Amino acid sequence: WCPEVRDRAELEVDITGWQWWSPLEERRLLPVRLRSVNEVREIMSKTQAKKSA
Amino acid sequence: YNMLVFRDPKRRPQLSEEERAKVVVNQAEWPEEFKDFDPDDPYKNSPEIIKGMSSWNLFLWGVECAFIYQFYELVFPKSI
Amino acid sequence: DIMVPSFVYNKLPVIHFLQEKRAEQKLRRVLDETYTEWTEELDQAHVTDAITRSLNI
Amino acid sequence: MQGSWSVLKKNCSNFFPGLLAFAQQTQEAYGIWLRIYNRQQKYGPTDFVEQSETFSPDYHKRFHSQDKNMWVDKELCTEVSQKEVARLMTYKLDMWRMAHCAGALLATGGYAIPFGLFWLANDTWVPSSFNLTGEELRAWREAQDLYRYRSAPSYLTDTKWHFDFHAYPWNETQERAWDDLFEKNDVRRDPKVVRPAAEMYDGFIKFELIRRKSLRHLCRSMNIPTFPMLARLCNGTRVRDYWNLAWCEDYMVITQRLHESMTDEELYDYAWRRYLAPYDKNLNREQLMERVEDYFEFLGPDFVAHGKAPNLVILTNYVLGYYNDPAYLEGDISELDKNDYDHLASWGKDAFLRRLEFENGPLRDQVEAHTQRLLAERAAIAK
Amino acid sequence: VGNGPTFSTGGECMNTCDIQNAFPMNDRGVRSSSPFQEPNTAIYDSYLAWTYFQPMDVHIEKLPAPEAKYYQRHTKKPWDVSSTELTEIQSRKKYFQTLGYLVAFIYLYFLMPKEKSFSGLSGPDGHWIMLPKGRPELF
Amino acid sequence: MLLGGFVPRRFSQFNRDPCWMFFIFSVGFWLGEYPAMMIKYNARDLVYDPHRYVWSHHDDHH
Amino acid sequence: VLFSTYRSSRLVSKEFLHGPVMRFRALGEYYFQRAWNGTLNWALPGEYRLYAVMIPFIYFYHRWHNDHTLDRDHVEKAMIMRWGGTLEDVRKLSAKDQLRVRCFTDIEKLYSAYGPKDTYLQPPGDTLPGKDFYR
Amino acid sequence: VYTRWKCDRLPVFQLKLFTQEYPMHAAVGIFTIIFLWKHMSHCSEETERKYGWWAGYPYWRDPIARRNETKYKQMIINNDVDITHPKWTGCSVEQLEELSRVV
Ligand SMILES: CCCCCCCCCCCCCCCCCC(=O)OC[C@H](COP(=O)([O-])OCC(O)COP(=O)([O-])OC[C@@H](COC(=O)CCCCCCCCCCCCCCCCC)OC(=O)CCCCCCCCCCCCCCCCC)OC(=O)CCCCCCCCCCCCCCCCC
Ligand SMILES: CCCCCCCCCCCCCCCCCC(=O)OC[C@H](COP(=O)([O-])OCC(O)COP(=O)([O-])OC[C@@H](COC(=O)CCCCCCCCCCCCCCCCC)OC(=O)CCCCCCCCCCCCCCCCC)OC(=O)CCCCCCCCCCCCCCCCC
Ligand SMILES: CCCCCCCCCCCCCCCCCC(=O)OC[C@H](COP(=O)([O-])OCC(O)COP(=O)([O-])OC[C@@H](COC(=O)CCCCCCCCCCCCCCCCC)OC(=O)CCCCCCCCCCCCCCCCC)OC(=O)CCCCCCCCCCCCCCCCC
Ligand SMILES: CCCCCCCCCCCCCCCCCC(=O)OC[C@H](COP(=O)([O-])OCC(O)COP(=O)([O-])OC[C@@H](COC(=O)CCCCCCCCCCCCCCCCC)OC(=O)CCCCCCCCCCCCCCCCC)OC(=O)CCCCCCCCCCCCCCCCC
Ligand SMILES: CCCCCCCCCCCCCCCCCC(=O)OC[C@H](COP(=O)([O-])OCC(O)COP(=O)([O-])OC[C@@H](COC(=O)CCCCCCCCCCCCCCCCC)OC(=O)CCCCCCCCCCCCCCCCC)OC(=O)CCCCCCCCCCCCCCCCC
Ligand SMILES: CCCCCCCCCCCCCCCCCC(=O)OC[C@H](COP(=O)(O)OCCN)OC(=O)CCCCCCCCCCCCCCCCC
Known part of the structure; x- marks a missing residue:
């Protein structure tokens, strides 16, 4: 019932990817999180200014 | 505690002292198996697997098995 | 029967976490691209002015 | 695809007509290749004709270099048409498989006959010429697509895992390109967003440094026979030749806009030879055109300007991403209401399990407080 | 609550492992033993520390069942075997293997005599094989 | 790896788990075989083989 | 075409011997599939009870094999060589005599290198039979 | 998805493992x-007598x-096989009969 994880793990192991830690990808994705409303307001203002100019 | 090399695991505390002090203990809700619970002897009140079968009885059973293993040929020897 | 299964089982948590983060990233990108477009329409005052001029006033 | 008796009968019936058609195609393709080779030798760059050597920086092993050993003949349309190039590519695939089978036959004498029976029972490694009707051709294409589905995910996973484990992207745009490159075919990938991955991987690995296992996976995904694989510079040469022909045809089509005038079936075949459009997807002309335009966009303006395509590894991954179907999920959600460890219910809980339940259960705070207070009292008494 | 197992840990403590970030942290500050959220995760201190999760009866707001269209993916292939089917196959195979190994162990350690016994009462003394037959010219 | 499990606090608790019951039975066998050997092999009526000097492993391996 | 290379080609139904298999898996899982059962390279588990149960059983069956199959050969050789050099000569004795001889062999085994050497070295002047008794 | 260890049967996986994963090791073995x-x-026979038997x-x-x-x-x-042939005995049959009558 979580097929993507299963397929990725099985393929990684079948291609000699035994290791179970990926520090680099985690570092790229660790700080990802849904933004707050104020952050959304700031981003929308930035986009509107960019479109205007 | 330890029994030879086997050490009894201990649960790490998770509550702080302030929160812990506010906890009200009610042993009435606890199961009869664990009342007056003691970390140094948590299985004192635990039920026996077989009623009336003591640890010493099993120890003596093993000793008797050894005695049989060593003495049976003395009483019922067999030819080559 | 023993080794590959164990290493797959070890892999599962990290992959699950990374895929959840990836989906959150997709949702965040979807939200971030939304901007309200305020359109500008010809002011009716000029229309009124042109109407007056047509009257020869 | 697994072998079957029906396919065995089909191939046995069409064996000799298939051989005759293969011989005719061999003559035609030899003519086409003679024209192309003469043109390459006459007008080719000095490095391409002289076969300049490019060695790895670690073990100094020679391999084809994309920039030097690959050349796009922009003026090939004068001598050779697009259809001739497609025919040559198809014949190259069929000839590769036939040559491997013939080598096995010559090596093992008459002992390859049962292996031949196994071979004719499956359409995976038989030539296209063995199909004399539309239904047979459809089944053969289905078998090829099945093999591609079987092989491609391993290649994609190899590439992605190696890069992610041993390296990370430099900038955010590269991160986005890398992440979106390996998405499933159910979503549409923007070639402009994905292109920087080519330069990033050129920084990591070029086609001249491709490893032998990754090469084996790629050749599997391209329906290229791999046994005997041998050194990596043989199937590597096959891959280089096939993609050089594909790039020449792509330049011809882009310059002459032939795909717009190309018919539906020919367009589908053109996309298929690029590993963009599976036949089992039942794509229409709109989807085929979208995929072909995305492929051309991924090639980039520099391809037309100078005949330089992006990194071949990344290009192969991008095109094979269309065979990376979403992971299968079958079964109604109601199945999640069941239990998996009912067979253990008869065993119950032992003393240790009861202790764990008591300590970590809803009464955990009370037990923790009582235990800590008792320990503190005992420590105070000891002191 | 039942006695069933949970997501395997390997006897590891997730608050100090190399992939600890992949395990969610609860209010008490104890990282979960699984990618799932666990409220009552604990740590036990033997010679080495190990994390534990005790199953309990907890109610969770259940989102209504979606449609099959939005979560079913019919990309199954003839070579594909599901994890449940694989588990069934391996369970049966290991059951039969266990029976065979049990029989073999019994025969070896309680019935099979050792070869080349001094008295000759038990076990074979060896013999020759592949001897020529019907080849008078050989001699 | 010796991480956890039932651990009886003293002898009397070995009967609180079947596995430790079997363990204590085995320990009883182990320790009680020694007194049996003491009694059997230090018996008054035990007699050395008269023909013990006829043959020995020492001459065989030599 | 004759045999499938894929494990998916089933030879039996999914429900074949479901119950016994579930019982066997219940036996396997109850003690092993636990957080504290962390193995060291799959060979050394973390559950104490596994050691407590398996060490005695292994020792018991190994000892039974050694006593009834391996040391028996040495005992029989001693009996044969010391009492005629032939199996029939030994069988000419009574069960009690064989018991005495075998227990003397056990004595010799227990002494090993840490004991008196008169058990195999004949002191000068001893009246007991020598090595050439049966020759 | 397809994986050699999970999808292929045991003999096929064995051949793949020792042909495309550890072929050199198999060759050396x-x-x-x-x-x-x-x-x-x-x-x-002398070696068997010396060391070939558990107790001797x-x-x-x-x-x-x-x-x-x-x-x-x-x-x-x-x-x-005629074990009485002169090559086996080194003497003629008549000489063998004479020897038998003598001894
Ligand atoms: C009787 C003795 C037998 C001896 C034992 C043999 C044992 C078996 C071993 C295999 C033998 C060959 C089997 C037949 C192969 C078919 C012919 C062929 O080469 O096909 C092209 C094709 C070339 O592949 P490629 O990757 O495209 O080549 C890249 C080049 O850059 C390509 O260059 P390019 O890009 O410029 O393109 C050129 C292309 C352009 O042309 C075209 O595009 C037109 C098509 C041309 C090729 C058509 C091939 C058709 C194949 C099918 C034939 C019908 C089969 C019917 C089966 C059913 C029958 C009932 O034309 C070519 O393909 C020419 C290739 C070069 C010629 C190779 C032949 C050399 C040997 C023959 C001469 C021998 C002389 C002996 C003198 C003796 C003196 C004492 O061949 C292959 O697919 C390769 C073979 C695959 C199997 C390999 C197995 C291992 C081999 C190890 C050999 C080691 C040495 C021998 C000792 C072994 C000890 C263990
Ligand atoms: C008339 C025709 C036209 C003319 C002729 C034309 C030319 C024809 C020839 C060329 C054809 C080429 C294409 C062939 C394609 C098909 C290949 C194939 O076999 O596919 C698998 C094929 C099924 O294919 P499929 O179902 O279509 O699936 C294909 C998929 O795509 C799956 O695909 P995949 O890629 O996953 O599968 C690949 C798989 C292929 O492999 C397999 O799948 C394994 C096949 C065998 C499995 C057997 C399982 C059953 C075992 C039973 C055991 C006995 C049971 C008890 C019997 C009791 C009897 C009373 O793995 C490999 O490729 C491994 C390659 C290993 C290479 C080994 C190289 C060794 C080199 C040695 C080292 C040298 C180093 C250098 C040394 C230098 C020193 C100087 O397997 C079978 O059909 C199984 C047949 C089993 C037969 C019965 C068992 C054996 C019977 C033996 C009888 C012996 C009698 C004599 C005894 C005498 C005693 C004294
Ligand atoms: C639980 C227990 C179960 C039972 C277990 C049984 C016991 C097993 C114990 C040991 C197992 C491991 C042994 C490993 C040994 C070391 C291997 C090694 O070092 O390999 C390095 C290396 C690794 O191979 P690779 O190419 O890198 O990739 C291998 C992958 O498997 C390629 O995979 P891929 O995915 O990349 O490609 C897949 C696909 C890709 O598709 C294709 O490639 C298209 C189709 C290609 C067809 C074949 C083309 C061959 C072209 C010519 C090759 C050169 C010939 C040289 C001259 C002839 C020498 C004899 O290829 C295939 O499907 C190949 C089908 C082959 C089917 C035959 C497999 C063997 C089954 C048994 C049949 C023979 C039984 C004999 C004994 C009984 C007799 C009564 O080997 C080679 O370079 C291959 C050289 C092949 C030379 C020919 C064979 C020499 C061996 C003696 C043959 C004797 C024939 C006797 C006939 C009958 C006489 C009565
Ligand atoms: C049942 C059959 C049994 C058969 C048994 C025979 C052996 C197997 C047969 C063949 C099996 C099929 C597969 C073979 C391997 C394929 C390799 C491959 O993929 O190559 C692709 C490759 C094509 O790629 P490419 O891009 O065109 O060029 C490669 C790049 O240059 C690559 O660029 P790169 O960057 O890699 O450049 C480096 C490259 C550069 O090399 C090359 O690639 C160039 C071609 C090779 C040149 C080799 C000759 C070098 C000069 C020799 C000078 C000797 C002087 C001695 C004077 C003595 C005076 C008394 O490699 C080297 O540097 C290696 C040099 C060789 C070093 C040899 C060291 C040996 C040490 C010996 C130790 C002691 C031994 C024991 C004691 C002995 C004494 C008591 O193929 C070749 O280049 C040539 C392939 C030749 C295949 C072998 C043909 C076999 C013929 C057999 C005939 C006899 C049969 C007897 C039968 C007996 C009854 C059964
Ligand atoms: C129908 C079968 C094929 C017929 C022939 C076909 C055409 C020819 C094929 C190729 C011939 C190669 C010739 C030699 C090339 C160079 C190498 C060399 O120097 O060879 C020396 C020598 C050959 O002598 P020669 O040079 O021809 O000249 C004679 C000299 O005058 C002798 O001078 P010497 O001083 O060297 O003599 C010492 C002795 C030297 O002999 C040896 O050292 C024997 C070495 C055997 C090597 C086996 C290689 C494969 C191993 C696979 C992995 C096994 C792992 C461990 C498993 C343990 C538990 C089973 O020589 C012999 O007496 C040779 C007898 C060889 C008999 C081979 C029988 C193989 C049985 C394999 C059983 C596997 C059971 C697996 C059960 C699994 C169940 C789940 O040994 C070998 O070549 C051994 C390899 C033979 C391979 C034959 C082809 C594959 C196997 C087919 C039969 C399979 C039967 C399965 C029965 C299953 C029962 C349950
Ligand atoms: C190719 C033969 C050509 C000539 C015709 C021979 C017909 C003989 C009569 C057969 C009657 C019983 C048939 C029963 C069904 C057999 C189905 C079968 O072959 O399945 C193979 C099966 C393993 O199947 P699996 O690999 O898991 O996947 C199969 C799907 N691809 O494997 C098994 O489970 C084993 C099943 C064995 C069944 C008996 C096979 C006997 C074959 C004898 C051939 C030699 C000639 C016999 C001539 C007889 C004349 C009277």
Whole structure:
């Protein structure tokens, strides 16, 4: 019932990817999180200014 | 505690002292198996697997098995 | 029967976490691209002015 | 695809007509290749004709270099048409498989006959010429697509895992390109967003440094026979030749806009030879055109300007991403209401399990407080 | 609550492992033993520390069942075997293997005599094989 | 790896788990075989083989 | 075409011997599939009870094999060589005599290198039979 | 998705493992097996007597002699060998009869 994880793990192991830690990808994705409303307001203002100019 | 090399695991505390002090203990809700619970002897009140079968009885059973293993040929020897 | 299964089982948590983060990233990108477009329409005052001029006033 | 008796009968019936058609195609393709080779030798760059050597920086092993050993003949349309190039590519695939089978036959004498029976029972490694009707051709294409589905995910996973484990992207745009490159075919990938991955991987690995296992996976995904694989510079040469022909045809089509005038079936075949459009997807002309335009966009303006395509590894991954179907999920959600460890219910809980339940259960705070207070009292008494 | 197992840990403590970030942290500050959220995760201190999760009866707001269209993916292939089917196959195979190994162990350690016994009462003394037959010219 | 499990606090608790019951039975066998050997092999009526000097492993391996 | 290379080609139904298999898996899982059962390279588990149960059983069956199959050969050789050099000569004795001889062999085994050497070295002047008794 | 370990059957996975994953190791192992069976697959009767028996060679019945006797009897009977031939004995049949009458 979580097929993507299963397929990725099985393929990684079948291609000699035994290791179970990926520090680099985690570092790229660790700080990802849904933004707050104020952050959304700031981003929308930035986009509107960019479109205007 | 330890029994030879086997050490009894201990649960790490998770509550702080302030929160812990506010906890009200009610042993009435606890199961009869664990009342007056003691970390140094948590299985004192635990039920026996077989009623009336003591640890010493099993120890003596093993000793008797050894005695049989060593003495049976003395009483019922067999030819080559 | 023993080794590959164990290493797959070890892999599962990290992959699950990374895929959840990836989906959150997709949702965040979807939200971030939304901007309200305020359109500008010809002011009716000029229309009124042109109407007056047509009257020869 | 697994072998079957029906396919065995089909191939046995069409064996000799298939051989005759293969011989005719061999003559035609030899003519086409003679024209192309003469043109390459006459007008080719000095490095391409002289076969300049490019060695790895670690073990100094020679391999084809994309920039030097690959050349796009922009003026090939004068001598050779697009259809001739497609025919040559198809014949190259069929000839590769036939040559491997013939080598096995010559090596093992008459002992390859049962292996031949196994071979004719499956359409995976038989030539296209063995199909004399539309239904047979459809089944053969289905078998090829099945093999591609079987092989491609391993290649994609190899590439992605190696890069992610041993390296990370430099900038955010590269991160986005890398992440979106390996998405499933159910979503549409923007070639402009994905292109920087080519330069990033050129920084990591070029086609001249491709490893032998990754090469084996790629050749599997391209329906290229791999046994005997041998050194990596043989199937590597096959891959280089096939993609050089594909790039020449792509330049011809882009310059002459032939795909717009190309018919539906020919367009589908053109996309298929690029590993963009599976036949089992039942794509229409709109989807085929979208995929072909995305492929051309991924090639980039520099391809037309100078005949330089992006990194071949990344290009192969991008095109094979269309065979990376979403992971299968079958079964109604109601199945999640069941239990998996009912067979253990008869065993119950032992003393240790009861202790764990008591300590970590809803009464955990009370037990923790009582235990800590008792320990503190005992420590105070000891002191 | 039942006695069933949970997501395997390997006897590891997730608050100090190399992939600890992949395990969610609860209010008490104890990282979960699984990618799932666990409220009552604990740590036990033997010679080495190990994390534990005790199953309990907890109610969770259940989102209504979606449609099959939005979560079913019919990309199954003839070579594909599901994890449940694989588990069934391996369970049966290991059951039969266990029976065979049990029989073999019994025969070896309680019935099979050792070869080349001094008295000759038990076990074979060896013999020759592949001897020529019907080849008078050989001699 | 010796991480956890039932651990009886003293002898009397070995009967609180079947596995430790079997363990204590085995320990009883182990320790009680020694007194049996003491009694059997230090018996008054035990007699050395008269023909013990006829043959020995020492001459065989030599 | 004759045999499938894929494990998916089933030879039996999914429900074949479901119950016994579930019982066997219940036996396997109850003690092993636990957080504290962390193995060291799959060979050394973390559950104490596994050691407590398996060490005695292994020792018991190994000892039974050694006593009834391996040391028996040495005992029989001693009996044969010391009492005629032939199996029939030994069988000419009574069960009690064989018991005495075998227990003397056990004595010799227990002494090993840490004991008196008169058990195999004949002191000068001893009246007991020598090595050439049966020759 | 397809994986060799999960989808292929055991013999197929074995062949794949020892042909495309550890082929050199398999080749070396086969070489060593051939060497062992070509140079370390013989045991003389004296060696068997010295070390070939758990408690020692039981000279009182000489099972090696019985084994060789059975071997030679079987060979002679099956192959129809005339052990009285001059080459085996080094003398003519008449000389053999004369010797038999003498002794
Ligand atoms: C009787 C003796 C037998 C001896 C034992 C043999 C044992 C078996 C071993 C295999 C033998 C060959 C089998 C037949 C192969 C078919 C012919 C062929 O080469 O096909 C092209 C094709 C070339 O592949 P490629 O990757 O495209 O080549 C890249 C080049 O850059 C390509 O260059 P390019 O890009 O410029 O393109 C050129 C292309 C352009 O042309 C075209 O595009 C037109 C098509 C041309 C090729 C058509 C091939 C058709 C194949 C099918 C034939 C019908 C089969 C019917 C089966 C059913 C029958 C009932 O034309 C070519 O393909 C020319 C290739 C070069 C010629 C190779 C032949 C050399 C040997 C023959 C001469 C021998 C002389 C002996 C003199 C003796 C003196 C004492 O061949 C292959 O697919 C390769 C073979 C695959 C199997 C390999 C197995 C291992 C081999 C190890 C050999 C080691 C040495 C021998 C000792 C072995 C000890 C263990
Ligand atoms: C008339 C025709 C036209 C003319 C002729 C034309 C030319 C024809 C020839 C060329 C054809 C080429 C294409 C062939 C394609 C098909 C290949 C194939 O076999 O596919 C698998 C094929 C099924 O294919 P499929 O179902 O279509 O699936 C294909 C998929 O795509 C799956 O695909 P995949 O890629 O996953 O599968 C690949 C798989 C292929 O492999 C397999 O799948 C394994 C096949 C065998 C499995 C057997 C399982 C059953 C075992 C039973 C055991 C006995 C049971 C008890 C019997 C009791 C009987 C009383 O793995 C491999 O490729 C491994 C390659 C290994 C290479 C080995 C190289 C060794 C080199 C040695 C080292 C040298 C180093 C250098 C040394 C240098 C020193 C100087 O397998 C079978 O059909 C199984 C047949 C089993 C037969 C019965 C069992 C054996 C019977 C033996 C009888 C012996 C009698 C004599 C005894 C005498 C005693 C004294
Ligand atoms: C639980 C227990 C179960 C039972 C277990 C049984 C016991 C097993 C114990 C040991 C197992 C491991 C042994 C490993 C040994 C070391 C291997 C090694 O070092 O390999 C390095 C290396 C690794 O191979 P690779 O190319 O890198 O990739 C291998 C992958 O498997 C390629 O995979 P891929 O995915 O990349 O490609 C897949 C696909 C890709 O598709 C294709 O490639 C298209 C189709 C290609 C067809 C074949 C083309 C061949 C072209 C000519 C090759 C050169 C010939 C040289 C001259 C002839 C020498 C004899 O290829 C295939 O489907 C190949 C089908 C082959 C089917 C045959 C497999 C063997 C089954 C048994 C049949 C023979 C039984 C004999 C004994 C019994 C007799 C009564 O080997 C080679 O370079 C291959 C050289 C092949 C030379 C020819 C064979 C020499 C061996 C003696 C043959 C004797 C024939 C006797 C006939 C009958 C006489 C009565
Ligand atoms: C049942 C059949 C049994 C058969 C047994 C025979 C052996 C197997 C047969 C063949 C099996 C099929 C597969 C073979 C391997 C394929 C390799 C491959 O993929 O190559 C692709 C490759 C094509 O790629 P490419 O891009 O065109 O060029 C490669 C790049 O240059 C690559 O660029 P790169 O960057 O890699 O450049 C480096 C490259 C550069 O090399 C090349 O690639 C160039 C081609 C090779 C040149 C080799 C000759 C070098 C000069 C020799 C000078 C000797 C002087 C001695 C004077 C003595 C005076 C008394 O490699 C080297 O540097 C290696 C040099 C060789 C070093 C040899 C060291 C040996 C040490 C010996 C130790 C002691 C031994 C024991 C004691 C002995 C004494 C008591 O193929 C070749 O280049 C040539 C392939 C030749 C295949 C072998 C043909 C076999 C013919 C057999 C005939 C006899 C049969 C007897 C039968 C007996 C009864 C059964
Ligand atoms: C119908 C079968 C094929 C017929 C022939 C076909 C055409 C020819 C094929 C190729 C011939 C190669 C010739 C030699 C090339 C160069 C190498 C060399 O120097 O060779 C020396 C020598 C050959 O002598 P020669 O040079 O021809 O000249 C004679 C000299 O005068 C002798 O001078 P010497 O001083 O060297 O003599 C010492 C001794 C030297 O002999 C040896 O050292 C024997 C070495 C055997 C190597 C086996 C390689 C494969 C190993 C696979 C992995 C096994 C792992 C461990 C498993 C343990 C538990 C089973 O020589 C012999 O007496 C040779 C007898 C060889 C008999 C081979 C029988 C193989 C049985 C395999 C059983 C596998 C059971 C697996 C059960 C699994 C169940 C789940 O040994 C070998 O070549 C050994 C390899 C033979 C391979 C044959 C083809 C594959 C196997 C087919 C039969 C399979 C039967 C399965 C039965 C299953 C029962 C349950
Ligand atoms: C190719 C033969 C050509 C000539 C015709 C021979 C017909 C003989 C009569 C057969 C009657 C019983 C048939 C029963 C069904 C057999 C189905 C079968 O072959 O399945 C193979 C099966 C393993 O199947 P699996 O690999 O898991 O996947 C199969 C799907 N691809 O494997 C098994 O489970 C084993 C099943 C064995 C069944 C008996 C096979 C006997 C074959 C004898 C051939 C030799 C000639 C016999 C001539 C007889 C004349 C009277």
